[PDB]
């Protein structure tokens, strides 16, 4: 071959890249209750919004 | 070792014949004997009831060495 | 500057000390003591009421309400050789009916012992507890519920004693005491789990007794443990297509521990996803608890077509973990409801895929990345895998250069700067100068200077070569 | 079968000598003393095949 | 090193359960029925008892 | 300590301060403002006892326990310290009548994980319970009584875990809603929680402690036996009960096995109900309890028929018999694995096959017929 | 030297290092959320605390301290106790005023004791063994009022005694050290820390400021010794915090001790020589035989001359 | 050289919701509490109407 | 550097030194090519009956110099000291003046002389393709010439490591090869010369053509092998590194003694004071000059008179 | 380990199926597509089969 350079990342490299990193909880967004119109932006001053 | 390998399968199967031979005997020579004791309301224990609730002849030349007696 | 690897990841804290480990490994020898030590008393109290009431009441004869209470705690227990001359008295004096025969059954299928195997021998496996049950007398249990079978169909024979031809077979206690029968040879060793979908269920429709939807679950788990998918995903189709609205979660789980057994994980990924779409019937604990030891078996599968070259793939499984345990949040299926060795490795799965946005803000601080690379230097022979050693398709005659005019548009700057003397006999083909043609950002000076330079020199040279050739 | 696992040990006699100078190298790196008390599974003073390990 | 020591207290607690359950099996009554005639045993064997229900 | 309540702050004086200054965090500030503030104390007890911010505590409370939520979520806004823990009661009791569960849920995650687990309370889950209720949401219901259960590190870390008598009453209003509404998947997994926490006969142990508690303000020695328990009147009124119980049990179930024998031909019966899973009861109470025993065994029938004595405050077993009656039976035949099994409806035999000899369809087999269907013929194999 | 723009831009080589190595989580700063103290497991039976909840009020539940004096407390414990007939209730009751007395240091806490415990679990070989709740209150009592009645309930909790010493926490023996380094017995220091090796305890997360306080009351020549290969076993990152927290506790932050400590140099500069090394660089017969043959040579030759 | 695990085809992209198959007894049982489109009941081969009104 | 064993990994001072030079990086970095962009012309420095001396000053960024002597008779060009960033100058150069280059002198092997010699051997012999290239050297300069790799690892000439120098392969003064049967362009080189130390005025010289002679001189210090040029008709002396503007070379190199150094330096009191001294690196002087206004030489003959029996003098920070 | 496994094996085998125990390791073995690509550079180009 002698200078074979691949334009699609194999399937294994893929998969290490991936495991190596780990998920954010946030992303998931679920959500089942509501919006909380009172309390919710009244929070604690260090986390609030 | 290799030779006595076959004195045991041809050993085994001589006995397994026998007692495939002997249990569809007792079991289907049973079958027309029909004594009825659902009157007498017993345990249920007979010489067929006790062969029917018997598990599958595992035979001996399915068997390996270990299940024939030799240590693991 | 030197650059930095953007396909090597952020140095991050993903796992736990040995002291942790010992510990945890400690406080679960305890737990598995503490089973053990509360089956031990329970079983040592009915060993003594048992004694209690064959002694002080050798003449006084019991009730047959506390000796059937008696035999069913004795067999609970797995004690099933005290409790049969019990059930051959009271089935002799005509005083266990319908449902205590079933009772009989059910109880000899130890649901005492199997607790004690599920917390301490199966490790919370609960394949591995009709795995295990099988050992403690797997064929004379099987035996001792065939003949409790025959004597619950002789006293429904003769309980029954219009519909004359079809009784004791077309009632519901025929198809309870069966259900029973086949969830006692579901304890059993594997003669009996194979046959109960091929012996007992043809006996049952050869006997003519109209099953339900316990005799199903339990013929497809038979199925599951031996490892038949086709067959059990046959009778879940059938479930589907006539008795649909009947269908409990023990099929779903059926099919999760089969497959699960058969070792195909991508199955169980989609019987997951088809019991979070439709809902009902309601997820257990032990749906979780089946899917999750699912992932947690295909995590920990190594693979041979990569042959390990780098690492371990299988791993990249562990972070469906987070996703699921959201889902069990949408499902009202507790987390708290799990087994300690699987919240273990949930909790390990977790720590290993699991970020929130304070962390992530936190997390690639240069403190926190050389902490990392120096506590690799110092022991990391305590932590390493290694150490440890037009349209295409009707396009067939394609219309080349169609009138399309590129002079409406605007693409004026094409310009481009070529290397001094491409075919000058005096400037070498081979050169350093070869280099100038990978240069993108000062191109045009570039080549100005270089042409400026050429230029110069061959001028000088052709110079030198008139001074020299007229002077001598 | 026999000379072609013999030649592969022979091109690995300069890489070993260098691997086992790399064992030296992240040797003298440990952290001194017998160890911290968050990376073992052992007490000190005992085996841990002792009978009378757990006080 | 300690592999006889912690080997013998593994032979020895095989030992005391099958000392204690040796016990518990010679002191019961083992019955069995073919057709209303209960053989009555102990665990040694012995028949105790041949009687009819 | 109300003199030494301050904080001081830096000058950025030198380069390298500079330097740390422009590689800050994006929480620099109020993160190091909030630790060099209020922290855990030496003994383990909260930072809440704070002298300057002790009004804005007793406005807050006394704004929601009068009704006013979003005042007291304002005042909430203005608070430095950790509050305590009855603003976070005083809150939720105030978010229960309006049926809100997000904002009470919000209150319980702001000082949940955030604020040295100060939320983390029987009473506070408590109303985050009944506020579940109130809004009849199952899942949240699970949520409030994973989070009652806890994990190793709120329990054994931080030690902040629920008493036992507000796990009992959080977990029994809990179960009594999903018995209500024939949850039969989340009440069992309550009621294995109170059978492996062995909290069966707690009512029993409250209205025992109760009576002990009089005994010792009255000067009398107080213990605790079978038959002090078996002296209240939860136990002796059940027990009076529970022939009626197994009455109604038998006749829901005899009623049910009638209507699935008759929707197993389509309405005549069929002879699935000639003899059902069921005996005949005794004519004595004692042959009562035999067969509730002996038929519903699997969970403790007296403990389910105490709890199903009251609704809403009001006492049914007093006062409404056949609701009563109806609501103990409805509750067994849920909590029951036994019932559930000898319910069943009957189903159709699935029938074997085998693929074709000429094979024309793969989807089409040759089924195996069993010789009720099919008279005659010759005897089949297996 | 770079890559070019007209090449493929693929990934070169996936990198797995954090599935390589996998690492605890370590921070400089201690943990926000721990109890920081001696947590004492009140298990009672769900009756009696209905029962005795007006005199459970004004005693310490988890996270919480009432300042309820401790005279009010014992009184209500020698009036209503015997009301109550079960033994399990009263040792867990007698837990909470032990732990009420710590907290408020009052030492005639003690002859409770002596009043109910001391003659079925103490005295001349008592066969019953105490609940871990009580003995974990007692011994955190007289750690904290500095009572000698320490040494007595600790030499019953070894193997062949309690054997209650795996069950101890890490505060449990950071409470332990600190108060026998005040009161300075050199061979209470040596028992626990031997006992404490046994046990597989984390020395590494011992506090601080126990384990100087109980290094400097170090003074005999045997237990000296001893700790100099004791203080190997804490790790590196330990050891180095113990010196800077000796230097400050003798220094200028002296007044963060209630009682100051005393002065021990033996055992401050064996600790500041300790913590550099463990941190990076920045045939007698025989041999007088030989003196006295030579000493016999030199009065031969004369270079040893008698009286002139 | 193969490989170990279960071997598939791959999901039929054959739209079973508006495939209208053969009638079969059991449909022919069931079918008095059938829903069906009206493309079901009206068939161009084996309508079930006409086996309903049958 | 030098190779890293195991006593130079475990040292402390390596890694404080590395830090002390280098700051953050710890890794030197090299001497790397000049660009295109601001680099000079070749320029004519003198003009004779005889020769013509064409050079170019700072080649490198060794901060170098290169040299060539023309024969206005035969039209024969010869280089000293090859070492150009960019040798495709001098081939135009050479091609534009219609010269032949058949030899290149080399005072001493070090890397500052020799990083370029392969792509001037080719690139000149490229355009000769349109008899081959010489190279005159000292063999002492051998131990030099296998440290050319390792003196490419230090100084980032990646692209110059792996390839074999023209002085490495077979002469006429080493065994040939035995080839198969059944080639010569690497094989043997027939125009290569070896000089000798036994330098003399009488028989020392090549023969550039009428009538010029070039008397090579052996004169260590800076190297094992270092032999300068010295042409006495036009007064020119190419020193290489023995001598420069108001200094000497470099001794803190391997293979160099500072007693050579003031032997070689001695070994020069003989010529006349208009003799230019043509360096190796920076300006060009006289050595009438450097008698009256070097430091070093100065020191050297006040060593010599007060009676040190071995004088030793040398530049420490330099040039290499 | 267990004696059910040993037995779901020995029956499996007189079925004639695969034993789940060879199921324990992952194979992805040799995709068509390389198969294909590997027949085509050793053939170069695989003239005669187009
Ligand atoms: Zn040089
Ligand atoms: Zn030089």
Redesign the interface.
Do not use: H, V
């Given at each position: 071959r002698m200078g074979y350079?691949?334009?699609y990342?194999p399937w294994?490299?893929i998969?290490?890249?991936?495991?190596?990193?780990?998920?954010?909880?946030?992303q998931?967004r679920?959500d089942?209750?509501?919006?909380?119109?009172?309390?919710?932006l009244?929070?604690?001053?260090?986390?609030?919004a | 070792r290799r030779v006595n390998r076959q004195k045991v399968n041809v050993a085994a199967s001589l006995l397994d014949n026998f007692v495939e031979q002997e249990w569809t005997t007792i079991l289907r020579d049973k079958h027309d004997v029909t004594d009825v004791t659902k009157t007498l309301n017993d345990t249920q224990n007979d010489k067929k009831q006790l062969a029917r609730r018997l598990g599958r002849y595992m035979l001996f030349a399915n068997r390996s060495l270990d299940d024939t007696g030799f240590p693991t | 500057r030197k650059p930095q690897n953007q396909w090597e990841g952020v140095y991050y804290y993903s796992g736990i000390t040995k002291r942790q480990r010992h510990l945890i490994l400690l406080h679960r020898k305890r737990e598995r003591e503490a089973h053990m030590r509360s089956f031990n008393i329970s079983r040592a109290s009915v060993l003594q009421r048992l004694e209690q009431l064959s002694g002080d009441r050798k003449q006084e004869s019991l009730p047959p309400h506390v000796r059937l209470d008696l035999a069913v705690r004795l067999a609970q227990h797995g004690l099933y050789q005290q409790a049969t001359p019990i059930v051959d008295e009271l089935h002799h004096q005509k005083a266990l009916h319908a449902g205590h025969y079933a009772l009989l059954i059910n109880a000899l299928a130890c649901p005492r012992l199997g607790q004690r195997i599920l917390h301490c021998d199966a490790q919370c496996d609960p394949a591995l507890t009709y795995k295990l049950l099988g050992d403690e007398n797997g064929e004379e249990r099987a035996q001792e519920a065939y003949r409790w079978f025959d004597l619950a169909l002789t006293s429904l024979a003769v309980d029954c004693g219009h519909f004359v031809p079809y009784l004791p077979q077309g009632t519901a206690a025929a198809s309870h005491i069966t259900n029973a029968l086949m969830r006692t040879l579901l304890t059993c060793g594997y003669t009996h789990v194979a046959a109960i979908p091929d012996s007992v269920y043809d006996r049952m429709g050869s006997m003519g007794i109209s099953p339900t939807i316990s005799t199903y679950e339990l013929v497809m788990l038979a199925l599951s443990l031996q490892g038949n998918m086709v067959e059990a995903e046959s009778i879940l189709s059938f479930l589907r297509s006539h008795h649909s609205e009947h269908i409990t979660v023990e099929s779903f789980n059926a099919l999760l521990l089969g497959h699960r057994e058969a070792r195909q994980f991508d199955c169980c990924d989609a019987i997951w996803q088809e019991l979070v779409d439709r809902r009902w019937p309601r997820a257990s604990p032990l749906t979780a608890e089946l899917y999750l030891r699912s992932i947690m078996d295909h995590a920990n599968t190594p693979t041979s077509e990569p042959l390990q070259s780098f690492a371990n793939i299988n791993v990249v499984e562990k972070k469906k973990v987070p996703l699921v345990l959201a889902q069990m949040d949408e499902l009202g299926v507790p987390r708290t409801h799990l087994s300690r060795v699987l919240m273990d490795e949930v909790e390990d799965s977790l720590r290993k895929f699991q970020t929130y946005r304070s962390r992530f803000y936190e997390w690639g601080r240069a403190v926190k990345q050389f902490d990392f690379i120096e506590f690799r230097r110092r022991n990391g022979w305590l932590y390493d895998l290694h150490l440890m050693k037009g349209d295409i398709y009707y396009d067939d005659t394609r219309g080349l250069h169609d009138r399309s005019p590129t002079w409406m548009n605007e693409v004026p700057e094409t310009r481009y700067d070529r290397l001094y003397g491409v075919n000058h006999p005096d400037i070498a083909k081979i050169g350093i100068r070869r280099h100038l043609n990978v240069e993108y950002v000062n191109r045009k000076e570039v080549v100005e200077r270089d042409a400026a330079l050429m230029k110069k020199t061959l001028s000088s040279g052709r110079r030198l070569r008139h001074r020299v050739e007229s002077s001598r | 079968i026999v000379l072609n696992e013999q030649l592969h040990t022979v091109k690995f006699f300069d890489l070993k000598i260098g691997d086992a100078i790399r064992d030296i190298l992240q040797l003298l790196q440990r952290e001194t003393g017998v160890g911290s008390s968050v990376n073992r599974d052992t007490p000190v003073g005992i085996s841990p095949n002792n009978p009378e390990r757990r006080v | 090193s300690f592999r006889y020591t912690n080997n013998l207290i593994g032979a020895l607690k095989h030992r005391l359960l099958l000392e204690s359950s040796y016990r518990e099996i010679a002191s019961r009554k083992f019955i069995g029925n073919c057709r209303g005639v209960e053989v009555v045993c102990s665990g040694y064997g012995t028949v105790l008892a041949v009687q009819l229900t | 300590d109300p003199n030494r309540v301050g904080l001081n702050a830096a000058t950025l004086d030198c380069r390298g301060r500079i330097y740390r200054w422009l590689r800050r965090g994006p929480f620099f500030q109020v993160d190091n403002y909030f630790r060099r503030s209020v922290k855990l104390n030496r003994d383990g007890t909260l930072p809440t006892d704070f002298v300057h911010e002790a009004p804005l505590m007793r406005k807050i409370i006394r704004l929601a326990h009068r009704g006013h939520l979003k005042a007291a979520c304002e005042e909430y806004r203005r608070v430095t310290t950790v509050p305590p823990v009855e603003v976070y009661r005083a809150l939720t009791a105030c978010c229960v009548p309006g049926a809100k569960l997000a904002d009470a849920v919000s209150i319980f995650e702001d000082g949940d994980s955030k604020l040295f687990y100060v939320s983390r309370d029987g009473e506070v889950l408590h109303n985050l319970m009944r506020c579940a209720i109130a809004a009849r949401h199952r899942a949240r219901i699970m949520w409030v009584y994973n989070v009652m259960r806890g994990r190793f590190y709120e329990n054994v870390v931080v030690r902040a875990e629920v008493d036992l008598i507000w796990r009992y009453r959080i977990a029994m209003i809990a179960l009594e809603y999903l018995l209500d509404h024939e949850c039969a998947e989340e009440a069992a997994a309550i009621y294995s929680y109170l059978v492996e926490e062995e909290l069966l006969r707690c009512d029993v142990h409250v209205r025992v402690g109760l009576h002990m508690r009089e005994a010792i303000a009255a000067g009398k020695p107080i213990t605790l036996n079978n038959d002090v328990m078996n002296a209240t009147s939860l136990v002796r009124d059940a027990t009076a009960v529970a022939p009626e119980v197994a009455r109604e049990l038998q006749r829901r179930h005899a009623q049910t096995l009638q209507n699935n024998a008759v929707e197993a031909v389509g309405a005549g019966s069929a002879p699935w109900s000639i003899l059902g899973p069921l005996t005949a009861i005794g004519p004595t109470a004692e042959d009562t309890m035999v067969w509730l025993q002996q038929h519903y065994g699997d969970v403790d029938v007296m403990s389910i028929m105490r709890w199903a004595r009251f609704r809403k405050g009001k006492d049914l077993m007093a006062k409404d018999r056949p609701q009563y009656l109806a609501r103990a039976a409805a509750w067994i035949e849920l909590l029951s694995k036994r019932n559930r099994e000898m319910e069943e409806v009957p189903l159709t035999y699935m029938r074997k096959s085998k693929p074709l000899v000429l094979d024309t369809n793969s989807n089409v087999r040759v089924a195996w017929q069993t010789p009720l269907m099919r008279s005659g013929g010759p005897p089949r194999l297996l | 030297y770079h890559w070019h723009y007209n090449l493929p831009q693929g990934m070169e080589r996936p990198h797995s290092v954090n599935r390589t190595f996998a690492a605890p989580f370590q921070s400089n700063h201690s943990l926000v959320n721990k109890y920081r103290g001696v947590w004492i497991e009140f298990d009672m039976h769900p009756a009696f605390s209905v029962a005795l909840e007006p005199q459970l009020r004004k005693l310490p539940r988890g996270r919480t301290l009432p300042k309820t004096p401790a005279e009010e407390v014992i009184a209500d414990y020698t009036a209503l106790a015997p009301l109550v007939d079960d033994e399990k209730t009263r040792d867990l009751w007698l837990a909470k005023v032990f732990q009420h007395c710590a907290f408020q240091r009052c030492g005639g806490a003690m002859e409770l004791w002596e009043r109910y415990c001391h003659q079925r679990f103490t005295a001349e070989g008592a066969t019953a063994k105490p609940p871990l709740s009580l003995v974990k209150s007692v011994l955190f009592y007289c750690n904290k009022t500095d009572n000698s009645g320490w040494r007595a309930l600790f030499d019953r909790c070894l193997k062949d005694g309690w054997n209650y010493t795996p069950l101890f926490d890490t505060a449990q023996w950071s409470f332990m050290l600190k108060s026998i380094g005040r009161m300075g017995d050199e061979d209470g220091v040596r028992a626990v820390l031997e006992e404490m090796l046994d046990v597989q305890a984390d020395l590494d997360r011992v506090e601080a400021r126990s384990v100087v306080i109980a290094l400097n009351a170090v003074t005999n020549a045997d237990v000296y010794e001893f700790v100099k290969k004791y203080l190997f076993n804490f790790g590196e990152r330990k050891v180095k915090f113990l010196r800077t927290t000796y230097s400050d506790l003798r220094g200028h932050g002296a007044g963060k001790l209630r009682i100051p400590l005393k002065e021990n140099d033996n055992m401050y500069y064996h600790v500041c020589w300790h913590s550099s090394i463990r941190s990076p660089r920045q045939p007698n017969a025989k041999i007088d035989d030989i003196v006295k043959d030579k000493i016999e040579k030199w009065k031969a030759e004369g270079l040893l001359p008698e009286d002139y | 050289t193969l490989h170990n695990q279960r071997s598939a085809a791959p999901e039929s992209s054959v739209s079973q919701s508006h495939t209208v198959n053969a009638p079969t007894v059991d449909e022919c049982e069931m079918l008095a509490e059938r829903w069906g489109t009206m493309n079901y009941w009206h068939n161009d081969t084996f309508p079930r109407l006409v086996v309903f009104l049958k | 550097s030098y190779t890293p064993n195991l006593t130079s990994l475990t040292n402390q001072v390596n890694r404080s030194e590395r830090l002390r030079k280098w700051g953050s990086a710890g890794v030197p970095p090299g001497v790397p090519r000049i660009p295109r962009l601001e680099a000079k012309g070749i320029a004519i420095l003198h003009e004779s009956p005889k020769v013509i001396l064409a050079g170019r000053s700072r080649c490198n960024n060794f901060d170098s110099n290169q040299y060539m002597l023309i024969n206005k008779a035969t039209k024969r060009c010869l280089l000293v000291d090859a070492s150009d960033d960019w040798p495709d100058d001098w081939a135009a150069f050479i091609g534009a003046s219609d010269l032949t280059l058949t030899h290149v002198f080399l005072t001493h092997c070090h890397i500052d002389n020799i990083i370029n010699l392969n792509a001037f051997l080719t690139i000149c012999g490229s355009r000769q393709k349109q008899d081959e290239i010489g190279v005159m050297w000292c063999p002492a300069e051998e131990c030099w010439v296998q440290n050319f790799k390792r003196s490419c690892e230090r100084y980032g000439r990646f692209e110059e490591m792996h390839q074999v120098l023209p002085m490495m392969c077979r002469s006429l003064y080493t065994p040939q090869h035995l080839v198969d049967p059944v080639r010569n362009a690497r094989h043997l080189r027939r125009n290569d010369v070896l000089l000798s130390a036994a330098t003399n005025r009488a028989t020392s010289f090549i023969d550039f053509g009428n009538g010029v002679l070039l008397y090579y001189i052996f004169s260590p210090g800076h190297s094992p092998g270092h032999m300068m040029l010295h042409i006495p008709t036009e007064r020119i002396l190419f020193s290489g590194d023995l001598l420069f503007f108001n200094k000497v070379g470099r001794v803190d190199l391997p293979w160099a003694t500072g007693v050579r150094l003031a032997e070689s330096l001695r070994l020069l009191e003989a010529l006349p004071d208009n003799t230019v001294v043509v360096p190796g690196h920076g300006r060009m002087t006289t050595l009438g000059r450097e008698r009256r206004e070097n430091k070093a030489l100065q020191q050297c003959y006040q060593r010599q008179e007060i009676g040190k029996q071995e004088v030793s003098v040398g530049f420490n920070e330099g040039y290499l | 380990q267990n004696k059910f496994d040993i037995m779901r094996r020995e029956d499996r085998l007189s079925k004639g199926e695969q034993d789940l125990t060879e199921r324990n390791t992952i194979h992805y073995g040799v995709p068509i597509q390389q198969i294909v690509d590997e027949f085509v550079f050793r053939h170069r180009n695989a003239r005669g089969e187009r």
């Open positions: 350079i691949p334009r990342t294994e490299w998969a290490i890249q991936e495991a190596d990193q780990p998920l954010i909880a946030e998931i679920q089942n209750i509501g919006t909380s119109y009172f309390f919710s009244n929070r604690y001053w260090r986390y609030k | - | - | - | - | - | - | - | - | -």
